[PDB]
Amino acid sequence: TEFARSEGASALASVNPLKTTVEEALSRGWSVKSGTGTEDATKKEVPLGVAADANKLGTIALKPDPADGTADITLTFTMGGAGPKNKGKIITLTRTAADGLWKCTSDQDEQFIPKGCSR
């Protein structure tokens, strides 16, 4: 009876919005850093603005942290709070620095990978 399908959707919905946050910072030549806070004008770092534990299905992470746009970026949702099918699975959004484009890949069982994401 676990909610494996909606868990995947919820996990993706916690990281998908962050693509916009990342692009906006990079368009200014500011870096992005993990977590919450205020924009740091000394270092020119913009926080993602979301707590790592905002969604109790798991944890949000940024790599590299901080990220300046000159290397590939990942946003991961690690489903440590999920039920048995999804626990220990990770949804990764990867922004390739060479082209500025995003992809979504997941190590979930393929039945539960959300729309737009691949293995």
From Swiss-Prot:
<dbReference type="GO" id="GO:0044096">
    <property type="term" value="C:type IV pilus"/>
</dbReference>
<keyword id="KW-0472">Membrane</keyword>
<dbReference type="GO" id="GO:0043107">
    <property type="term" value="P:type IV pilus-dependent motility"/>
</dbReference>
<protein>
    <recommendedName>
        <fullName>Fimbrial protein</fullName>
    </recommendedName>
</protein>
<keyword id="KW-0488">Methylation</keyword>
<keyword id="KW-1133">Transmembrane helix</keyword>
<feature type="disulfide bond">
    <location>
        <begin position="104"/>
        <end position="117"/>
    </location>
</feature>
<dbReference type="GO" id="GO:0016020">
    <property type="term" value="C:membrane"/>
</dbReference>
<keyword id="KW-1015">Disulfide bond</keyword>
<comment type="similarity">
    <text>Belongs to the N-Me-Phe pilin family.</text>
</comment>
<keyword id="KW-0812">Transmembrane</keyword>
<comment type="subunit">
    <text>The pili are polar flexible filaments of about 5.4 nanometers diameter and 2.5 micrometers average length; they consist of only a single polypeptide chain arranged in a helical configuration of five subunits per turn in the assembled pilus.</text>
</comment>
<keyword id="KW-0281">Fimbrium</keyword>
<dbReference type="GO" id="GO:0007155">
    <property type="term" value="P:cell adhesion"/>
</dbReference>
